[PDB]
Design a binder for this molecule. Sequence first.
Ligand SMILES: N=C(N)NCCC[C@H](N)C(=O)NO
Ligand SMILES: [Zn+2]
Length: 411
Amino acid sequence: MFVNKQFNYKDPVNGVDIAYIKIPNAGQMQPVKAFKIHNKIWVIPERDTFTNPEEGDLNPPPEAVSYYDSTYLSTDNEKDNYLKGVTKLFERIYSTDLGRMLLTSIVRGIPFWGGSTIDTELKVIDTNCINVIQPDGSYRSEELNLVIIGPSADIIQFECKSFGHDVLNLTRNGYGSTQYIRFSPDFTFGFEESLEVDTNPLLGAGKFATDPAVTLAHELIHAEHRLYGIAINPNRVFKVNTNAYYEGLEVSFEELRTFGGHDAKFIDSLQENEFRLYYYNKFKDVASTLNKAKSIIGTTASLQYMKNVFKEKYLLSEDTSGKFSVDKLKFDKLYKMLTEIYTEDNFVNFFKVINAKTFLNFDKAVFRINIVPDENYTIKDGFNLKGANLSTNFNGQNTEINSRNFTRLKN
Ligand SMILES: N=C(N)NCCC[C@H](N)C(=O)NO
Ligand SMILES: [Zn+2]
């Protein structure tokens, strides 16, 4: 039961799990109503016009496969439906063993307290918090790990982003930082079945639709990487050979790793070792920082308590003197779990749903959906409902057969 509370958009703010909040480095935004669906995880049912200065408008630019609709997610009812859709996908992910593990890792992934210039001092990094406005009018500073928010101008441009320090590279120095995922449970993508000799022949008809749960899990995987500060520099790319009429299409290692499967293998053995040793070295530095820490600022919690929070996050070893160190095999398990076990491909397998076999299998269309009604989608079966006749040959995902759950929009 990942979300132990039925949240309706119109429920009165209480200053605890329903409240108007302000986001860091968002300049001077108006407070937005948010919901805390799980410890360290909030959801803002608004179009994202706060995380980025240059993207504070929902206006359709000169363009470039995208989808725009400045009116999407503008009504309370829509926001209410958005909230229920996100909450439902989390329950779907969490219902699996893989998902239960991923979300647990995310919740234990508190961004490191490395905001002090004094090495004998542990301090929080302000951009890893939000201000929770209370019913009285005061604001309470709250640390959080994950924020799910609506998309910006391009509705289908989902992504996992964060604020990041002035000097430090939080998503790549092992510290981690609060992750903001632009996502929408109201849309999904259509892909075409790459007819391979051993693939099921009884496949209903043309287009199939991506299960929004796989899509959210995809972003959650980026979040895990970023929260543990072991994300692969987005500069790193593989020059994919597509056509002969193409002298090259770049695809980042971070994406190939996240998708997993055959795709992940484009990251050769030399690069894998490089990233692993690098991050191993980074964890060892976090251990040293914790070891030199004698005081904590922004006081409330005890020093030992916070040190312990990071001993748990990084799976550090503590001797009888109380000094932390990094254990090679524990690091290996943690790192492998985050980069090789949590992948889009492994989720497609747990969920038992049809999905593109690789990015190379680019989505043909964009569909409008609504997973909230149980008559349409369930936590356990997604679109391929049991009693129904949709639970056969993935009929539930067939946009021809399950034409009533999909409404074509673009491409
Ligand atoms: N299935 C999709 N078409 N996903 C939409 C987001 C694609 C984006 N590049 C991304 O992967 N972000 O993480
Ligand atoms: Zn991605």
